[PDB]
Design a protein around this nucleic acid. Structure first.
Lengths: 353, 253, 253, 252
DNA sequence: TTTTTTTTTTATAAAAATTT
DNA sequence: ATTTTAATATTAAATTTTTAATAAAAAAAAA
DNA sequence: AATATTAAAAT
């Protein structure tokens, strides 16, 4: 949630951001933040001003979106790991209080729009009113267990556990749309993972190594750059935008140098600015153990999927049935090797003007 | 850059073989020859296409050019050429326009085709030069037939070599399959024979959809050289008529 | 335990490409006398009776009455794996539910063993009597296929009439009348294309069209159609499989 | 009427040419010959069929019958007929049916086919004979190759007629084709030669799609007369079996 | 036997709907 | 002057099934 | 948790 990092790497070091197809990640075990996906499915998949629900009044749009998107991860060749979110750290209290103030403001203008009596304004202000719940992640972990996708529970924010999973070499990419996963230390980030029917969206893949080679920084230095840019664990200095942050991290090579030489009349350093604790959080978070988890893609249980999704969620049997048959087709394709395993990439550019 | 190809049906067959596997590729055009080391969009297969300058007619290349050609549009442009057509490649200094002049055999229909280019970057793999432990030389129609009929009943071949010969075994939900071949050193034939050099009796599982994409080069070479060893990817060499090779690489399952 | 080595690969390819259009699952009544099949249409209108006697096989040896049934879309695809001049060898076991389909090459180069899943189905083995018919014609099979596929463009029904000077095919459809007034052809110089009619009584009643278009996919089996009918009875479209047997299709009118 | 034709493949090729372009056709058949003059289904092109009564072996037209046939249906009815078939066209005055009694070429199968006529407005456009400046007489194989292979690039063909060679230029997003044809006079059998009439260099664009339905009449003749001027819609003339012409007109 | 020549069948890219 | 930046607003989808249209073959029709 | 933008800064 770093303010202006995607545009920063797009406009400073564009050799790191390589746009790729969804088909080009065949046989790649990748780690996906689950709560960002759940918010995508309970925001995007709506009818008539309402979330997609069953006849019992339970929310089931997240299970719908998770099932179809995760199947689309299977035919494109990639192997998903759904790192679910855990307890956020104690420095995120201001950010979650700001989120709760935003949702309460959206609730009061939702009540104002319902007093005025619209439809699109009401569906927008309840699209902003979306919250993950323990039963939401519980039912999605249940669904990915029956599909055979390896669910993981982070003890921190799941971008950190995704970064620790790619850092151990267990998975190829941390496939979150969040900027904070690069600062948590993912060597590969990839964004915009809408694996869809003929969308042809390029997967915005962020590689940390070409960032730290092109910007002339190391890992703690990029942490200090993102803290000065503005994370979700501490505030930023007012008046310091992206390009000034790039210049200050490039010409002082610390953040305590920016503390010790700056004018307080013009650029106000905050007195409650707890940058060292968020720096140590981005260096050493409370991640899961990457070498003790079960990263396996088992056979999908057809029968409990039909019983769960047709007794509790009353989904139509033909769509999820054909989805699990093409899951079976993609699982026979899942053992297929990649040619990067046998040949090393030497001509990385092969430029054509 | 001026490359006049007298047998332009060769280039028509090359881009028909390149049509379905990949859609965009970067041509490593140098003075030694026209090259194309391109990899699949699913990043599993690879195309090593090499057309040397000794197999062209009056080849010229000043700079080390490299242009990125939409191969579906190049296949649509090269399908305008005839069977006995003389195709003249031409390009400028900048990667903007690739001229494809189709000189008629009886000089009555000169067909100038300027082609719009793309500016994309593709990944090159460093392929080592090693001795494969199982070199299988096969007729091209039989390898085409084996791939297109085992793909009906299977998702993957299990290519097993032995003293007797290669064994294209496929398995599926439709019924179990098996195609066995045998080498013949007795008939001493030229194109319809199977030549199998063995070191190890290798048994590797290859995806058969990509082998169907590979068997589109069958018109380019009656001799198909399947060279493989244990846990090293299959190279499927279609030796073009005295210009070079169209080598197809494929990762085992 | 069962061996059905048959010398002509193309003609069992013709049988299994003839029967893929009508019927999905058929029970192959395999006995010691010869290979039989009898099943009703997938729309449950038509009836197909295939007989392949063991005299026209190359070698034949069957022990038990194997009334086992395959999917014919599956066996159709497995027989499109065959070559045209291949040698079909249907093999089977007793405990194993696999119909082996070893296809020998015309040379001694390759073998094409295909096991097959037996999707066993219990059809009703009914005994159709072979009585006399009021109209029997011997018309050429490509010409009957032309009549069926070229009156398919007008209506939904064929009104076959038994005129004395040749058989008349009509179709009152949306585009108009379609009366082929085909003539009596008992010429000596046409050996099998002569329209040989042995009629004891004229008859004319409305037949089907979509099923006749399904029937004429048996066209490359024989050059003749021994088409038979009478009053208030199913049609016979008999196709003589070389010297092996008859593929009688039946049509409810 | 009654019009026997022993080269029924010519009428089959006429109807398979005219099936995909136009759908409602007013076969204004007179005693001077079969002719048809109707526009496109989208009223952009124009078809001018002429089948003179001297080319048919048997002809009989007592009354000027202007009837209207859906050419998809008549195309299916002529798709029934064989290649060497003797196709007759018959009509009765009082009942609106067009009988098409075919003849297999062994006198052993007679195929009778009635066609349901339908009443519609008879087109009476007409065209004066313009001074066609640039007349290009190419073979139909290269014209079908040029239109079918310039449709792969663009949607418009800029035909640049000149003194020595005619250029067919199409430029779309996939590139820029430019097909030149030299005025061949040395290696020919008087059917493979491209000859261009010297009046003036003529350069104006014509769209594709409709020119592909124009060159769908490729098996009718081995010659395409391409008569054009600087403003006039071009004549794409197909010589029908040296007994008539099939003229095509396309507004640039 | 070799090569065209088409309907068919095909995965296809746009676009409607709603998938609950 | 620019361009820098913290404000202010906004969205986050994926089918199956139809719509006209596609281009690669199925599968003959004819050199 | 993302993108755009424009008055308002921001020297």
């Amino acid at each position: 949630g770093i303010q202006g990092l995607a545009k920063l790497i797009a406009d400073v070091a564009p050799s790191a951001i390589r746009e790729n197809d969804i088909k080009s990640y065949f046989g790649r075990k990748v780690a996906i933040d689950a709560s960002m996906s759940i918010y995508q499915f309970l925001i995007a998949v709506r009818q008539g001003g309402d979330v997609l629900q069953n006849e019992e009044g339970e929310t089931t749009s997240h299970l719908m979106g998770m099932f179809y998107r995760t199947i689309r991860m299977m035919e494109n060749g990639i192997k998903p790991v759904y790192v679910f979110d855990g307890k956020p750290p104690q420095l995120k209290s201001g950010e979650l209080a700001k989120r709760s103030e935003r949702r309460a403001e959206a609730e009061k203008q939702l009540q104002q729009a319902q007093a005025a009596g619209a439809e699109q304004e009401v569906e927008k202000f309840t699209k902003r009113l979306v919250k993950v719940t323990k039963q939401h992640n519980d039912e999605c972990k249940h669904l990915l267990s029956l599909m055979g996708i390896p669910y993981l529970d982070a003890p921190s924010e799941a971008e950190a556990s995704c970064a620790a999973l790619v850092k151990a070499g267990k998975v190829y990419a941390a496939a979150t749309e969040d900027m904070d996963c690069l600062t948590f230390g993912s060597p590969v980030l990839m964004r915009h993972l809408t694996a869809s029917e003929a969308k042809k969206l390029p997967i915005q893949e962020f590689h940390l190594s070409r960032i730290l080679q092109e910007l002339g920084l190391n890992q703690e230095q990029f942490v200090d750059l993102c803290i000065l840019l503005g994370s979700d664990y501490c505030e930023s200095i007012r008046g310091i935008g992206p390009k000034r942050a790039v210049d200050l991290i490039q010409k002082h090579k610390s953040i305590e140098e920016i503390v010790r030489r700056l004018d307080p009349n013009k650029y106000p350093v905050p007195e409650n600015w707890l940058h060292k604790e968020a720096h140590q959080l981005f260096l050493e978070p409370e991640v899961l153990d990457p070498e003790s988890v079960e990263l396996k893609w088992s056979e999908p249980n057809e029968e409990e999927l039909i019983k769960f999704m047709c007794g509790e969620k009353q989904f139509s049997e033909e769509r999820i049935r054909s989805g699990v048959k093409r899951l079976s087709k993609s699982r026979q394709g899942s053992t297929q090797g990649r040619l990067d395993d046998f040949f090393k990439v030497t001509g990385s550019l092969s430029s054509a003007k | 850059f001026e490359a006049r190809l007298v047998q332009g049906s060769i280039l028509k067959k090359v881009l028909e073989a390149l049509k379905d596997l990949i859609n965009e590729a970067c041509w490593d055009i140098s003075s030694s020859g026209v090259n194309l080391q391109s990899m699949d969009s699913s990043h599993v297969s690879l195309v090593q296409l090499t057309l040397r300058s000794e197999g062209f007619d009056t080849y010229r290349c000043d700079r080390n050019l490299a242009m990125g050609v939409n191969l579906t549009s190049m296949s649509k442009i090269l399908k305008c050429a005839g069977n006995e057509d003389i195709i003249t490649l031409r390009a400028e200094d900048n990667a903007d326009t690739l001229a494809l002049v189709f000189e008629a055999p009886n000089q009555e229909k000169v067909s100038d085709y300027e082609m719009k280019l793309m500016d994309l970057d593709v990944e090159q793999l460093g392929i080592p030069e090693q001795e494969y432990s199982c070199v299988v030389k096969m007729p091209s129609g039989e390898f085409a037939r084996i791939c297109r009929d085992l793909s009906h009943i299977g998702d993957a071949v299990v290519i097993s070599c032995a003293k007797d010969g290669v064994k294209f075994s496929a398995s599926g939900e439709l019924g179990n399959g098996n195609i066995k071949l045998s080498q013949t050193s007795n008939v001493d034939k030229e194109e319809e024979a199977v030549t199998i050099e063995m070191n190890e009796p290798v048994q590797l599982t290859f995806a058969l959809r990509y082998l169907n994409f590979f068997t589109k080069a069958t018109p380019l070479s009656s001799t198909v050289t399947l060279s493989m060893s244990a846990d090293v990817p299959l190279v499927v060499e279609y030796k073009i008529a005295d210009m070079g090779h169209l080598k197809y690489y494929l990762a085992p399952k």
